[PDB]
Amino acid sequence: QHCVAEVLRLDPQSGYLKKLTNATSILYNTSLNKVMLKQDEEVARCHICAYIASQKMNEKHMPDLCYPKKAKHLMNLFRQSLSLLVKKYCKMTTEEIIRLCNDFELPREVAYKIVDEYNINASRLVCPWQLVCGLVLNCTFIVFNERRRKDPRIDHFIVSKMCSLMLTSKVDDVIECVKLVKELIIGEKWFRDLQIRYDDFDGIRYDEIIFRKLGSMLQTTNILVTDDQYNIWKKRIEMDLA
Amino acid sequence: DFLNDDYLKILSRCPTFMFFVEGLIKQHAPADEILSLLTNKNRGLEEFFVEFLVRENPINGHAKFVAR
Amino acid sequence: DNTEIIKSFKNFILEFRLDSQFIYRDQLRNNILVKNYSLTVNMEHLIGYNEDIYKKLSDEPSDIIPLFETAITQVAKRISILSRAQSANSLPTFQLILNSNANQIPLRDLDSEHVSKIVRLSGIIISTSVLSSRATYLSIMCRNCRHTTSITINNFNTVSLPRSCNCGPDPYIIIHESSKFIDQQFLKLQ
Ligand SMILES: [Zn+2]
């Protein structure tokens, strides 16, 4: 039942969940009662089980359910028993770029946004590797400012990652990949919502920069260090005896 | 004469002063002069303050006698 | 995360004290003069100091233990250089040792539950079989590429050799004279 609920709640990755666990139960039951249905490794035995249980209740969905040789076999058997940017004009899918975005373990909402961007504005293109590259980079720089604000060892590792995920030794093209999308995507309300959420504004806060730029000297350029820093740095030399 | 404690606190977060500190941590396994001077006794601190405050900043006089 | 736990552990090393005297700190300082590369521990001493490691070392110990080993080695590495700066290259992992007296449970009352957890007990000894050896660090050369590599193993005295670096499968000889090993034995109880 644990494994049943596991594989059944593996579909997302009201009446649905209930009726589907009941379905898989009595389905597996019917399939194992008689002596007719054998040599079926339990390795895989809760999948077109789940697909036909989708087919049964009320509404069914061909996509995102089967997601192979024996998949067809067992189906019939049960059903009877009952570089990257020089490349010109490439093509992509939903899950291709879900992969290239989920490699950073970023959320799926940002990915859906880049997907919407694409399927509306993937029309007039030369190469979508550039656009989606720049997109997910300017997702990373905006959401990952904290860890980077304290760890400048990150910005080399990250750019190195996407330099070789798309197979180049030259990188200034990637720099352009970022600034051009930033020129493009600059002013949409959803981009706006993300900037108020994760608070980069060029990577710097609002309540600081406005005094940086309106015309002030109270502007806190933190050359000096904060108090808790020293409060914890002192422990390193406390035990200096050893 | 008016060298207050809060001033003494904030000047401690001179990060270059931390560079100097740790440079001497690794120059000397013992830790006697640093406890002699540091904020754990602020007397030596303010003493060092005036001591390194008085200096010439010889860069500027260097530019001067260079012009000369 | 794991480094939070590492620090919660390493503070117990030098920031623990009872009867107004450091215990494990100078224990290590002695053990290293002994050239021992291990220690002794009580786990009773960790319950009051901190509860962020106990309830998880209980049920996922092997997940937590080599961490402590590495923390120990980290403490060693500073103190080695500091004591060289004080007076007067190859520092492996230190076997940890510990004990307890919380309880004793017998072989009879076991079951197939609380398996891979940690248990306390009594009994009587028989075996003194033989000093059977294992490896810890062993060098490898390919027979065709002449392509040197290296391997080290940690706890389980999981993986095997590499299946491919044409040389074909099994391209590797194990060199001994620049390899390293350790001992164990097979000990009984009743
Ligand atoms: Zn080879």
Task: For chain C, positions 55-94, list CB contacts with chain B under 8 A.
Answer: 82-83, 85-86
Find the closest chain C residue to B31 by CA distance. C86
> Chain A within 8 Å of C83 (Cβ-Cβ)?
yes
Say how many C-beta atoms besides its own lie within 10 A of residue C108's C-beta: 5
What does the alpha-carbon distance between residue C76 and residue A218 come to, in Å, rounded to a whole number? 46
Say how many C-beta atoms besides its own lie within 10 A of residue A31's C-beta: 19
CA atoms within 13 A on the CB side of A105: 1
Neighbours of A, requiring at least 3 CB pairs below 8 Å, are: B, C
Cβ contact, residue pair B30, C86, below 8 Å:
yes
Count how many residues are written for chain B. 68
Label residue C184 left, alpha or beta by phi (over 0 means left) and psi (-120 to 50 means alpha).
beta
Residue type, A59: E
DSSP string, A192-226: HHHHHHH--TTTS-HHHHHHHHTT-S----TTS--
C182, β-bridge pairs = C134
Asked how this structure was determined, the answer is cryo-EM
Tokens 């992992």, located at residue = C93
Q: Which of A222, A225, A226, A231 to mutate to test the interface with B (most CBs of B within 10 A)?
A: A225
Sequence-distant (6+) residues with CB within 8 A of B38 are B21, B44, B45
Backbone angles phi, psi at C20, to 5 degrees: 60, 35
> Chain A within 8 Å of C45 (Cβ-Cβ)?
no
8-state DSSP, A241: T
| Closest approach of A198 to chain B, Cα-based (Å) | 30
**With contacts defined as CB-CB under 8 Å, which chain A residues touch C78?**
242
Sequence-distant (6+) residues with CB within 8 A of A202 are A209
> Chain A within 8 Å of B31 (Cβ-Cβ)?
yes
Residue type, C3: T
DSSP collapsed to 3 states, chain C? CCHHHHHHHHHHHHCCEECCEECHHHHHHHHHHHCCCCCCCCCHHHHCCCCCCHHHHHHCHHHHHHHHHHHHHHHHHHHHHHHHHHCCCCCCCCCCCCCCCCCCCCCCCCCCCCCCCCCCCCCCCCCCCCCEEEEEEEEEEECCCCCCEEEECCCCCCCCCCCCCCCCCCCEEECCCCCEEEEECCCCCC
8-state DSSP, B39: G
Neighbours of B, requiring at least 3 CB pairs below 8 Å, are: A, C
Q: What is the dihedral of CA A166, A169, A170, A174, to 10 degrees?
A: 30
Say how many C-beta atoms besides its own lie within 10 A of residue C21's C-beta: 8
Sequence-distant (6+) residues with CB within 8 A of A159 are A171, A174
Cβ contact, residue pair B25, A229, below 8 Å:
no
Say how many C-beta atoms besides its own lie within 10 A of residue C174's C-beta: 12
| Closest approach of A103 to chain C, Cα-based (Å) | 20
Find the closest chain C residue to A241 by CA distance. C82
> Chain A within 8 Å of B6 (Cβ-Cβ)?
no
**With contacts defined as CB-CB under 8 Å, which chain B residues touch C86?**
29-30
Residue C135 CA to ligand 1 centre (angstroms): 22
| Closest approach of C82 to chain A, Cα-based (Å) | 6
